[PDB]
DNA sequence: AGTAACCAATAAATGGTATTTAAAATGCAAATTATCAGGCGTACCCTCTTTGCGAATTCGCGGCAGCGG
């Protein structure tokens, strides 16, 4: 479908649109996993 | 109201060759103050959205393209 949109801004927004937000639970989940990795090392 | 240029003489006529004198002044490189230029950090919560709107009704020409026997 790509209409050869050479505009880099369009490519950036198209790439970033895929990943979806998640709040109040993930942040805690990922922070815990980061601290766990650091504690392991 | 007194002739000399006679021959010695006198040092003054210069402008030229230098190791000095130390005082100055003139530069020189430190110490020692001001001020400028970087780095870091900030805990309520905030989540694609802004754009260009059109190097702006050109036009004529060419040719490298996709569809098609």
Swiss-Prot record:
Entry's localization field: Cytoplasm
Main function: Sigma factors are initiation factors that promote the attachment of RNA polymerase to specific initiation sites and are then released. This sigma factor is the primary sigma factor during exponential growth. Preferentially transcribes genes associated with fast growth, such as ribosomal operons, other protein-synthesis related genes, rRNA- and tRNA-encoding genes and prfB.
Family assignment from sequence similarity: Belongs to the sigma-70 factor family. RpoD/SigA subfamily.
Domain remark from Swiss-Prot or TrEMBL: Contains 4 domains, connected by flexible linkers. In the active conformation, the domains are in an extended conformation, each making extensive interactions with the RNA polymerase catalytic core.
Subunit structure: Interacts transiently with the RNA polymerase catalytic core formed by RpoA, RpoB, RpoC and RpoZ (2 alpha, 1 beta, 1 beta' and 1 omega subunit) to form the RNA polymerase holoenzyme that can initiate transcription. Identified in a complex containing RpoD, the RNA polymerase subunits RpoA, RpoB and RpoZ, CRP and DNA. Interacts with Rsd; this prevents interaction with the RNA polymerase catalytic core and with promoter DNA, and as a consequence, promotes transcription from promoters that require alternative sigma factors. (Microbial infection) Interacts with Escherichia phage lambda antitermination protein Q.
Protein name in UniProt: RNA polymerase sigma factor RpoD
Gene encoding the protein: rpoD
Coverage span on the entire protein: 90 to 130 of 613
